[PDB]
Structure formats: C-alpha cells, structure tokens
DNA sequence: CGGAATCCTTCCC
DNA sequence: GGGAAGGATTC
C-alpha cells in the first residue's frame, strides 16, 4: 500500500494571489465576514507573508489589523476556489481510479498498482507537481507513506510547495518523536487533555493504561492513536460523497420572536437550496445558536424529498419546537440538509 | 465571540 | 435498537 497526499498551499490566498499578481509579495488575508458590525468575521487562510507575523486561520479580523493594519483583507469566493480545485482534482485523476478527495484542498491517491517503490513515487509526485504549476499557477505539497495519516504528516513537514517521502524507518521514527498535536484528526480540546494525562507524543499512547486514555478522549480516538503507535492503523482510500449542506447566518439583533426570526431562516433555506442544485435531501435540521453561544438543533426526516415549499413549512414548525424548549435569546439561526437521494 | 461539515459519543416515553 | 440531539475536528 503506497499513498500520495496533495495539499495546495495556502489555497484560497493563492488562488487570489494568482488570480491578482499585483498582490504578489505582500500579506494577503482572505476573510469570512460575518456582516453584524463591519469587519466583524474570522480570517479563512492567509498567506505565509502575513502567518510570519501572526495573522493565521480562525483569528478575529479586528485582531488580524492591529498586527497587520496595512495587508490585504479579500472576501472568501468559494466559488472561484472550488473550480481551481475541481480542475486539479481531475488532473491527478489521471494518475489513480482509487483517489480520495478530503477536502476542497486535499486529496488522497493509492498508487499501489501504479508504481513499484517510493524512488519512482517521488518521481510520479514531481510530474504531479509541475503539471499543477503549468496548468493552474497553483503550488501543491506531496506526502507519500504507506498510509494516509503518514503520507500527511510528510506533507504538513514539508510545506509549502514541496515534497517528502516518509519510509518504514521514518514512521517509526515519527512515532516516538511528533507532537501529539501534529497527529490529523487530533485537535486543541483532545491535545490539551493529553498534555495534563502526561502523553505528549505518539508513543506515549502505550506509556499509560487504556482506561485512562479512553476515558478522557473517547474510544475512536484511544484506538486512533494506539493503532498509529502499534504501526498498524491501515484505513482504504476511499470515493468520498458530500454528506450534507446548510448555510448559518448571524442576526442584526438577537431574538426569540419567531416573525423577525423567520426572514434570516428563510434565507439560509435560499442559499441552502442553492447550494444543493438537484441535490435533493429528505431531512432538514434548523440550528440556532444561542446567546449563550451554545449550539442547538432540531431536524426531521422524511419518506421522500423535500420541496423548497415543504423546506419553508417544516423550518418554522422546527423552529418553532427550539423555541418551546429553549428560553434563551437565538444569536444565529442556519439550516442543513441530509439524506440525499439519487 | 465565523462558517461549514465531517465522523463520534449519546440517553428515550 | 434504534433515533435524534449532541461533541470535536476541520473548513
Ligand atoms: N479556524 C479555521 C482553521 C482553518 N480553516 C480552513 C481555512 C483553510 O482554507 C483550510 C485548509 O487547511 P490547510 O492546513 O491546508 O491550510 P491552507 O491551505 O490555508 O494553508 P496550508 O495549505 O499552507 O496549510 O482550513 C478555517 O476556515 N478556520
Ligand atoms: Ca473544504
Ligand atoms: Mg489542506
Ligand atoms: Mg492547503
């Protein structure tokens, strides 16, 4: 089993570099604005001329301008980013049937029948690479293992715009000396409960019991880790399908009257449908978020699909039903929609 | 005090 | 033995 991981470098700041050359060489930040005061939001991604001084992904845009008041602050266009991806997601098609797209950003290729060592892997990850740079001006890094969680180590070591192979001397290597924060699918709330449990890296999963592992961080994860620590964690490359699609939107003034509510509601149901395109789903959930920045939801499913007309009915019912069993103020109300057909 | 979407735990009448 | 409402990760 030989997998090989793309990820493209600091997409969505990129692609706006490439699309806009002036921007070349400067901080460039690219934000979610969230439309309740102006400049209010989050920074989605920048570019590593403005991560150099602090301004990184998840970070307030007011705090990102009083570090760097004089960058450029771009609205995200998911949709200018998302046809750049689908183009380069066909492109290294054109290398594995076996191909596993993560995310927008992300994809992964079993190449087991298509090469015979990690010499000639590293080779097939240049051709992957240049063939990017000359087709869409975008700058990729590739990670190659014998695993996906590995070849994706290698690729986080070895951004941006590069490439590294991790053999089965390396991951044992990696085993006993990455942060445990490193490790894919192991966020902040699981890497600070670990810290205190004593584990810092991966090998110390074996360094402690299981029951106090499992006990704070949960069994899919307790087993994650050990499995990666034993060298035995060996998930398929798989055709990943979207599961589901909402849209959340935050009020000029929390609220718990229903009428005032309804035409926020009704326009994430818009956008939500919008974004299906003959998608068709048989269960909607609203979520409200609360004043008290707690997330509340309720859903419902369905025999058959639902209608725009059925989406506008059933969400106020559900709404409706959040506001029975909730007495606090909804700061953000949103819609998502599963189950797809077809 | 942002958005979006995944793959887990999670008791119900 | 489900369901549906929840966490956490990532985006
Ligand atoms: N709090 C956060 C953290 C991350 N992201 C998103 C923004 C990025 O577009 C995406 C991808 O993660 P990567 O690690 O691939 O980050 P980038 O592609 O931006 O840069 P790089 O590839 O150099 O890491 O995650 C987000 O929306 N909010
Ligand atoms: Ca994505
Ligand atoms: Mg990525
Ligand atoms: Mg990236």
Same mark, same amino acid.
């Given at each position: 089993?030989?997998?090989?991981?793309? =990820?493209?470098?600091?997409?969505? @700041?990129?692609?706006?570099?490439?699309?806009?050359?002036?921007?070349?060489?400067?901080?460039?930040?690219?934000?979610?604005?969230?439309?309740? +005061?102006?400049?209010?939001?989050?920074? !989605?991604?920048?570019?590593?001329? @403005?991560?150099?001084?602090?301004?990184?992904?998840?970070?307030?845009?007011?705090?990102?301008? %009083?570090?760097?008041?004089?960058?450029?602050?771009?609205?995200?266009?998911?949709?200018?980013?998302?046809?750049?991806?689908?183009?380069?997601?066909?492109?290294?098609?054109?290398?594995?049937?076996?191909?596993?797209?993560?995310?927008?950003?992300? !994809?992964?290729?079993?190449?087991?029948?298509? *090469?015979?060592?990690?010499?000639?892997?590293?080779?097939?990850?240049?051709?992957?690479?240049?063939?990017?740079?000359?087709?869409?001006?975008?700058?990729? $890094?590739?990670?190659?293992?014998?695993?996906?969680? +590995? @070849?994706?180590?290698?690729? #986080?070591?070895?951004?941006? &715009?590069?490439?590294? *192979?991790?053999? #089965?001397?390396?991951?044992?290597?990696?085993?006993?000396?990455? =942060?445990?924060? #490193? *490790?894919?699918?192991?966020?902040? /709330?699981?890497?600070? %409960?670990?810290?205190?449990?004593?584990? &810092?890296?991966?090998?110390?999963?074996?360094?402690?019991?299981?029951?106090?592992?499992?006990?704070?961080?949960?069994?899919?994860?307790?087993?994650?880790?050990?499995?990666? !620590?034993?060298?035995?964690?060996?998930?398929? /490359?798989?055709?990943?399908?979207?599961?589901?699609?909402?849209?959340?939107? $935050?009020?000029?003034?929390?609220?718990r009257?229903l009428?005032?509510?309804?035409?926020?509601?009704?326009?994430?149901?818009?956008?939500?449908?919008?974004?299906?395109?003959?998608?068709?789903?048989?269960?909607?959930h609203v979520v409200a978020v609360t004043?008290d920045?707690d997330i509340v939801s309720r859903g419902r499913?369905?025999?058959?699909?639902?209608?725009?007309?059925?989406?506008?009915?059933?969400?106020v019912k559900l709404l409706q039903k959040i506001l029975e069993e909730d007495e606090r103020k909804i700061?953000?109300i949103?819609?998502?929609?599963?189950? +797809?057909?077809?």
């Open positions: 089993m030989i997998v090989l991981f793309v =990820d493209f470098d600091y997409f969505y @700041a990129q692609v706006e570099e490439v699309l806009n050359p002036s921007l070349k060489g400067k901080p460039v930040v690219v934000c979610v604005f969230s439309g309740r +005061f102006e400049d209010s939001g989050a920074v !989605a991604t920048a570019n590593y001329e @403005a991560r150099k001084f602090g301004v990184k992904a998840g970070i307030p845009i007011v705090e990102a301008k %009083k570090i760097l008041p004089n960058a450029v602050y771009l609205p995200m266009r998911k949709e200018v980013y998302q046809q750049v991806s689908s183009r380069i997601m066909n492109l290294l098609r054109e290398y594995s049937e076996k191909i596993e797209i993560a995310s927008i950003d992300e !994809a992964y290729l079993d190449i087991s029948d298509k *090469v015979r060592d990690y010499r000639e892997a590293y080779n097939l990850g240049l051709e992957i690479k240049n063939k990017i740079l000359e087709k869409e001006k975008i700058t990729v $890094t590739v990670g190659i293992s014998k695993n996906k969680v +590995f @070849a994706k180590i290698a690729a #986080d070591m070895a951004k941006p &715009n590069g490439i590294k *192979v991790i053999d #089965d001397e390396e991951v044992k290597r990696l085993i006993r000396e990455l =942060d445990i924060a #490193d *490790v894919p699918g192991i966020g902040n /709330i699981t890497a600070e %409960k670990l810290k205190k449990l004593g584990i &810092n890296k991966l090998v110390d999963t074996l360094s402690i019991e299981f029951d106090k592992l499992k006990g704070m961080i949960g069994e899919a994860k307790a087993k994650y880790l050990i499995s990666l !620590a034993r060298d035995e964690y060996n998930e398929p /490359i798989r055709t990943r399908v979207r599961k589901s699609i909402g849209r959340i939107v $935050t009020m000029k003034r929390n609220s009257n009428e005032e509510i309804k035409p926020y509601l009704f326009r994430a149901i818009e956008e939500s449908y919008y974004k299906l395109d003959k998608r068709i789903p048989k269960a909607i004043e920045l499913t369905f025999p058959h699909g639902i209608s725009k007309e059925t989406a506008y009915s059933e969400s700061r953000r949103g819609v998502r929609f599963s189950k +797809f057909i077809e």
